């Protein structure tokens, strides 16, 4: 703040750190799971 008579050590003590993680929009997946599956038990 650096405006009153007394000041804090640095901006680390003027800050609140949050453990919240947020993500943007991700491309939707379409072809990954639209076909039927053919299981195998050999090469």
């Amino acid at each position: 703040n650096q405006s009153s008579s007394v000041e804090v050590s640095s901006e680390s003590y003027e800050t609140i750190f949050s453990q919240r993680i947020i993500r943007d929009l991700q491309k939707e997946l379409v072809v990954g799971a639209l076909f039927e599956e053919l299981p195998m038990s050999s090469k």
Binding site: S5, V6, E7, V8, S9, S10, S12, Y13
Partner: protein
């Protein structure tokens, strides 16, 4: 890392004259102080052996 606060140095007031009693100098001067900080860390020591 670990950080702690360190308190600043000492201050000093002012002697006012009786002449300046009417004015705003009667308050005196302003004592100010900014904190400080220190940090600590570690290093790694290791050894190995095979039998």
């Amino acid at each position: 890392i670990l950080t702690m606060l360190v308190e600043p140095d000492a201050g000093r007031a002012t002697w006012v004259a009786a002449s300046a009693y009417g004015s705003d100098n009667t308050t005196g001067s302003e004592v100010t102080g900014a904190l400080t900080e220190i940090h600590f860390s570690t290093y790694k020591l290791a050894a190995k052996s095979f039998i």
